[PDB]
RNA sequence: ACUGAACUCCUCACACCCAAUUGGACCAAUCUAUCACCCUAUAGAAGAACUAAUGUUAGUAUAAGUAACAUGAAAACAUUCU
């Protein structure tokens, strides 16, 4: 009976773990965990959290490389709040559109 | 709490231990030497020592002859105490038992002695001995001793 | 180079064992009777030339050969290792005996050879030093002398107490290595083309074999250390338990050479002495 | 009071195998110069003793023959006596007890 | 009931070649149903497992329970065979690497209490068993040094692995 | 349960896949009853399936044995040495069939739990993470409190 | 292997020979240390407030009586020094404590007896190995030379001090001697109860709180009674006689020193602040020092006038 | 903003999570009829399946080597003594 039930806590434990690295990879590189999510999935890059786990440990350059992409998004964002209005949108922040 | 105390506690009570300690008595004057448990041995060595000393006393001494009428609870040992026993001993002044220890009692494993009036007849017995002054530490301390005498 | 001389000397001497070995082939027994007090009547039906007092020890019981140090043999001293070679009466010799006069020289013996060779392996390479005697001095005199010339390089070189120190850690150190004391009976001959390097032994082998009626010379190795002896030794190193190079003195007849004798001291574990009891001992062999 | 519950075989293997409950090696133990047998270093020898005992024995039921009767010690001190050997000076004025077999070595 | 260790003496191995390490010998004695509890008998067989034959005799000669006087009795007669039928050379140069008690054929007997109840005794039997091997007794396990201790935990950090990634 | 279980990782026998594909599966031995209606399976298997297969899969020798036997089998043996027996007692061709493809297809390795879905030898091409990575270095590498 | 011990492998002539050898080493030892002050004696600073000197090892002799000259009696100890000796001196660096510490050492026991190592400390330090050694804590302005012997003089009539000793060991006792539990009644239907403890705890906790009274070995601890007067010295015999009890039995070793309670912070003014030097031979000390209001032996009878 | 179910989506597969009760598909072993012939098949039967009834019998544990029990002393083992 435990070796059902713990499918469905093992599957959590995997995602708490891989959100414990990502946090810890975005805190190395100034950023935090839910910043670096939801910019990368505003840049729409849908790398999920295990691969994103694997990057950070195995190809720290790599993830440096997503964390900047996260943050700039986030200071586009940023920019585009404090400057509402019909201001050009950001370079990273447009788009692509799918039908 | 038994601190002082000094009296081992035998038997049913306390005549019961001096009867005791009487019987292996007796026993030890008759035969000049015997086998007991080594607690009662132990106790019984004092009681042999003052017989022997009483005995010495004399036998016109009336407190030494009732202590040994008391005592030896064989009155032909009597004579043997006043007339072997304290005349063998009238050099010595103490030290007239030689008490040692014996493999345990098959029956019980108790621990037992043998304790014999010294000078006595029997074969005797396997006494431990000491080293030989001949070995190698005895000779290094002789030499030891001779260079301290020869220095004074 | 000393390494290339104890490697020769080392193959020298197992030749030498070979040689011995094989003269006398397959197995011929002799009857040893044990003529010692207790277990009497026991007779060993042993091989000759390869079975020693110590296979009649461990025949009889471990008892016999761990407080046995030697062996008399028809009368005379063995080593508990040396083969015997005969039908014979052996009684077992250990330190507590009545008179253990001759266990307490081989013992006496077998620490001035190990004091030699920590002497010998001590010394650094540019220094020579060169091994003369062990003099048979009693056990009253209270230390084991072993006689030596050093290199002239350290004409006015004592030792220090550091140095003591470490002369008895090497010693230590060979008794915990606890090597045991392998003998021969060996000619004259193949004595000096052992010690052909070495003059002091070339003519106390010739002394030997002019005490001797034949040219055989007791030669005894601990571990890779040839060296004569003036008799039997004890079986093993690890017999010793307390040992103490005590101090080193110049002998007054210097000119000739600087014949430097190291006095020790030393007690088997059978007769283990106190702390206090060891110090004083120590006190009296510094002389 | 009862047991709440059985204990366990590694509990119980703890309990009785802990070295309070082991036997202890004992070092005291050595040869027997005399005999060669095993003793105790406090212990007597229990061969020699056993010896002594019956030579004892012997000695002890020729002094009851002698005697004839409870009750008949001797005034006098004793002297054993073995084949071959005659009273000294000494032995002169002491009953002998008379023992049909040579003196032992260890007796004297 | 099982009677396998007496046959363990009966097996013959093939001769060794000549460049082949001397096989040491090995005895198998036991004694069957000895008014002794298994239990009881444990103690000694511990005691002495593991010690050369003198030194296993020199300890059952001074200890005091009745089970020492068997075992003694059972090493003796071990030495004894392993000298005349198996070709040991020396008596001395034999130690016990095997020394266990075994649960005998035990009988039941009733025991009265106080009120007409009662309990069931078991007149215990035990056997006992040794293997005698040939050679001088294996050096005890040394305990292991602080050097290795920290070896060992060195050792645990290095095979650390990054768990649960690619 | 994976506690109560060998485990294992992700491999292949010797790199099955880089160079050439090579069929791990080498041996299968059908042990066919004549008579028995378990085998019945087996029978038209064998009259009708094996030789299909056989050609289809030349690197694997196929013995075809028939003997009285209650539990038809057949002994998979593959190039790493692993021998699996299953038994094909009443069992369908279809059934046959899938089972005797199945081993076809399936490695040599032992059917375990497998720790990991993946298994890279070269798992970093950038360099694996280490402390010291995403950390600045200091002028002339003095560490923090350090005067000089 | 097998354990030894030193007379083990003597013979019967070397028995005597090593015992005679021994103690006279013993007594020469003990003898060197008599002149302290002639032997690079460490700086003897001044006494100062807040000083505190070192103490003794005493052996507790007995008990007799003692009146004063208001014809009231006193009941006071003996404690005997006997071969009390400095041994170990560790600054408050090196100790790592609020003050630095002194190791005294008292009643000299065989060489035989010991452990190696402090046979070995006992050996560079001079002095044969001690029964028991404490620790004093004190100042660095009371700090003496390892080795320097302590006399009775040490402390002065009038002083009070306090004294460490192990208690009587009772064994493991009941509760009712323990802890002087009441007991139960030995009559009116008592049935197996008259020295049994009562109820251990409460229903509600279900435990028993940690601390709680009950039967199991009581002495052999060590206890300090503080504030005993110095009634009088002999320094003849190295004797102090103590106000009242001390904890141990007779001929049990106490720790003596100066009493920390607080009516007594700074009275050490006038007596030896480092320790009494007989050595100095300022005045040999008469062979028995008396408290003022002392009735010596060989006085008058008191009247109350 | 993010975290967060067995909810939902995703790749593949799906009869595969309610007590009493009810319907159904299979089935271990045994015997019988035919098969089969290193363990079987199609059927007919039935003393046809036990982690549980202070269940019954037997074995062995736990409590536990615990509670309890026993032999007056010496000796020549004649005998004497308490
Ligand atoms: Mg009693
Ligand atoms: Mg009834
Ligand atoms: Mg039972
Ligand atoms: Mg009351
Ligand atoms: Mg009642
Ligand atoms: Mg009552
Ligand atoms: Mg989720
Ligand atoms: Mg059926
Ligand atoms: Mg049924
Ligand atoms: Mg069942
Ligand atoms: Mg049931
Ligand atoms: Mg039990
Ligand atoms: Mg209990
Ligand atoms: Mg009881
Ligand atoms: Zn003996």
Redesign the interface.
């Given at each position: 009976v435990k070796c059902t039930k713990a499918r469905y806590l093992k599957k959590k434990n995997m995602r708490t773990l891989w959100i414990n690295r990502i946090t810890a990879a975005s805190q190395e590189h100034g950023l935090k965990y839910p910043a670096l999510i939801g910019n990368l999935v505003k840049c729409q890059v849908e790398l999920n959290r295990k691969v994103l786990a694997d990057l950070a440990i195995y190809e720290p350059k790599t993830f440096k490389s997503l964390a900047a992409l996260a943050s700039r998004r986030r200071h586009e964002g940023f920019a585009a709040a404090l400057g509402d209005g019909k201001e050009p949108e950001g370079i990273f922040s447009r788009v692509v559109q799918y039908h | 709490?038994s601190?002082g105390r000094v009296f081992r506690r035998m038997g049913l009570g306390p005549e019961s231990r001096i009867h005791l300690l009487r019987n292996l008595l007796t026993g030890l004057v008759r035969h000049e030497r015997i086998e007991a448990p080594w607690a009662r041995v132990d106790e019984m060595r004092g009681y042999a020592e003052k017989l022997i000393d009483y005995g010495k006393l004399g036998d016109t001494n009336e407190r030494a002859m009732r202590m040994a009428d008391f005592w030896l609870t064989e009155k032909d040992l009597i004579p043997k105490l006043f007339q072997v026993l304290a005349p063998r001993y009238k050099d010595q002044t103490g030290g007239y038992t030689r008490m040692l220890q014996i493999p345990n009692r098959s029956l019980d494993r108790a621990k037992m002695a043998v304790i014999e009036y010294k000078g006595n007849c029997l074969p005797p017995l396997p006494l431990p001995r000491?080293?030989?002054?001949l070995?190698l530490?005895?000779q290094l301390?002789?030499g030891?001793?001779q260079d301290?005498r020869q220095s004074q | 180079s000393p390494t290339e001389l104890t490697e020769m000397r080392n193959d020298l001497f197992n030749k030498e064992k070979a040689r011995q070995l094989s003269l006398t082939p397959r197995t011929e027994k002799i009857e040893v009777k044990h003529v010692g007090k207790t277990d009497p009547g026991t007779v060993f039906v042993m091989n000759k030339n390869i079975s020693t007092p110590y296979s009649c020890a461990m025949h009889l019981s471990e008892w016999y050969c761990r407080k046995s140090i030697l062996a008399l043999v028809d009368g005379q001293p063995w080593d508990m290792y040396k083969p015997l070679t005969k039908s014979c009466e052996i009684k077992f010799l250990t330190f507590?005996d009545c008179d253990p006069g001759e266990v307490n020289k081989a013992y006496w013996r077998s620490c001035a050879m190990m004091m030699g060779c920590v002497i010998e392996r001590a010394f650094k390479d540019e220094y020579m030093v060169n091994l003369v005697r062990a003099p048979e001095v009693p056990v009253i005199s209270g230390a084991f002398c072993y006689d030596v010339v050093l290199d002239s390089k350290l004409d006015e070189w004592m030792p220090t107490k550091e140095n003591l120190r470490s002369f008895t850690k090497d010693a230590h150190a060979l008794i915990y290595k606890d090597l045991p004391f392998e003998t021969l009976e060996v000619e004259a001959k193949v004595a000096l083309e052992i010690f052909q390097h070495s003059k002091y032994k070339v003519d106390f082998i010739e002394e030997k074999a002019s005490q001797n009626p034949e040219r055989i010379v007791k030669l005894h190795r601990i571990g890779d250390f040839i060296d004569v002896s003036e008799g039997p030794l004890i079986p093993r190193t690890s017999i010793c338990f307390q040992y103490e190079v005590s101090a080193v003195h110049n002998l007054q007849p210097t000119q000739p050479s600087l014949i430097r004798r190291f006095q020790g001291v030393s007690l088997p574990?059978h007769?283990?002495?106190?702390?206090?009891?060891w110090?004083?001992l120590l006190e009296r062999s510094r002389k | 009071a009862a047991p709440k519950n059985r204990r366990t075989i590694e509990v119980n293997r703890c309990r009785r195998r802990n070295p309070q409950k082991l036997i202890k090696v004992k070092?005291?133990i050595?040869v027997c110069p005399e005999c060669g047998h095993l003793k105790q270093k406090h212990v007597l020898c229990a061969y020699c003793y056993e010896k002594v005992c019956k030579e004892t024995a012997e000695i002890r039921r020729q002094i009851g023959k002698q005697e004839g009767g409870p009750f008949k010690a001797p005034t006098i001190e004793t002297v054993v006596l073995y084949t071959g050997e005659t009273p000294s000076e000494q032995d002169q004025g002491k009953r002998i007890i008379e023992r049909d077999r040579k003196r032992p070595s260890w007796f004297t | 009931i099982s009677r396998k260790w007496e046959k363990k003496n009966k097996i013959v191995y093939p001769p060794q070649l000549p460049g082949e390490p001397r096989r040491p010998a090995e005895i198998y004695h036991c004694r069957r149903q000895i008014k002794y509890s298994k239990d009881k008998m444990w103690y000694l067989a511990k005691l002495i497992r593991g010690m050369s034959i003198d030194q296993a005799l020199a300890q059952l000669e001074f200890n005091d329970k009745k089970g020492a006087k068997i075992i003694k009795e059972v090493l003796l007669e071990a030495q004894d065979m392993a000298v005349r039928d198996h070709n040991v050379e020396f008596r001395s140069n034999l130690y016990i690497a095997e020394s266990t008690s075994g649960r005998g054929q035990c009988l039941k007997r009733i025991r009265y209490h106080g009120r007409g109840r009662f309990g069931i005794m078991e007149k215990v039997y035990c056997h006992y068993f040794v293997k005698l091997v040939e050679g001088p007794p294996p050096p005890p396990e040394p305990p292991k040094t602080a050097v290795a201790h920290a070896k060992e935990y060195i050792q645990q950090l290095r095979s650390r692995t990054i768990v649960h990634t690619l | 349960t994976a506690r109560g279980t060998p485990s294992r990782f992700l491999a292949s026998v010797l790199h099955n896949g880089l160079g050439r594909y090579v069929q791990q599966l080498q041996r299968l031995s059908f042990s066919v009853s004549r008579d028995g209606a378990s085998s019945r399976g087996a029978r038209e298997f064998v009259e009708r399936e094996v030789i299909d297969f056989a050609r289809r899969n030349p690197g694997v020798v196929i013995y075809v044995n028939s003997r009285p036997c209650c539990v038809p089998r057949v002994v998979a043996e593959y190039l790493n040495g692993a021998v699996r027996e299953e038994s094909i007692h009443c069992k369908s061709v279809e059934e046959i069939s899938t089972l005797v493809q199945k081993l076809a297809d399936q490695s040599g390795l032992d059917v375990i739990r497998i720790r990991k879905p993946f298994h890279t030898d070269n798992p970093s091409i950038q360099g694996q993470w280490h402390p010291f990575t995403n950390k600045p270095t200091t002028f002339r590498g003095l560490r923090p409190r350090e005067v000089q | 292997?097998?354990?030894?011990?030193?007379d083990?492998?003597?013979?019967?002539?070397?028995?005597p020979?090593?015992k005679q050898?021994?103690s006279d080493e013993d007594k020469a030892q003990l003898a060197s240390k008599l002149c302290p002050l002639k032997d690079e004696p460490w700086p003897i600073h001044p006494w100062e407030p807040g000083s505190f000197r070192v103490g003794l090892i005493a052996l507790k002799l007995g008990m007799m009586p003692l009146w004063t000259k208001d014809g009231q009696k006193h009941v006071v100890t003996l404690l005997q020094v006997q071969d009390c000796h400095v041994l170990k001196y560790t600054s408050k660096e090196n100790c790592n404590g609020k003050m630095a510490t002194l190791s005294v050492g008292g009643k000299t026991v065989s060489?035989?007896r010991k452990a190696?190592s402090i046979?070995?400390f006992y050996?560079e330090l001079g002095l044969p190995p001690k029964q028991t050694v404490k620790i004093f804590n004190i100042t660095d302005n009371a700090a003496i030379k390892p080795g320097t012997p302590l006399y009775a003089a040490h402390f002065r009539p009038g002083q009070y001090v306090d004294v460490t000793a192990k208690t009587?060991g009772?064994?493991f006792?009941g509760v009712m001697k323990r802890w002087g539990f009441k007991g139960q009644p030995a009559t009116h239907g008592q049935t197996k109860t008259h020295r049994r403890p009562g109820a251990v705890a409460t229903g509600d906790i279900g435990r028993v709180w940690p601390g709680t009274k009950m039967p199991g070995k009581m002495g052999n601890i060590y206890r300090t009674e503080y504030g005993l007067k110095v009634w009088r010295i002999n320094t003849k015999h190295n004797i102090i006689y103590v106000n009242g009890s001390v904890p141990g039995?007779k001929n049990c070793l106490v720790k003596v020193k100066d009493s920390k309670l607080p009516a007594y912070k700074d009275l050490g003014k006038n007596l030896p602040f480092p320790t009494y030097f007989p050595d100095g031979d300022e005045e040999e000390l008469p062979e028995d020092l008396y408290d003022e209001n002392v009735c010596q032996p060989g006085a008058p009878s008191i009247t109350f006038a």
């Open positions: - | 709490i601190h000491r080293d030989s002054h070995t530490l005895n301390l002789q030891l001793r301290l | 507590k574990v007769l283990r002495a106190h702390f206090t009891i110090d004083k | 070092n005291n050595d | - | - | 292997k097998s354990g030894t011990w030193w083990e492998h003597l013979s019967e002539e070397n028995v020979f090593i050898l021994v060489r035989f190696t046979l070995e050996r009587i009772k064994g006792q039995h």
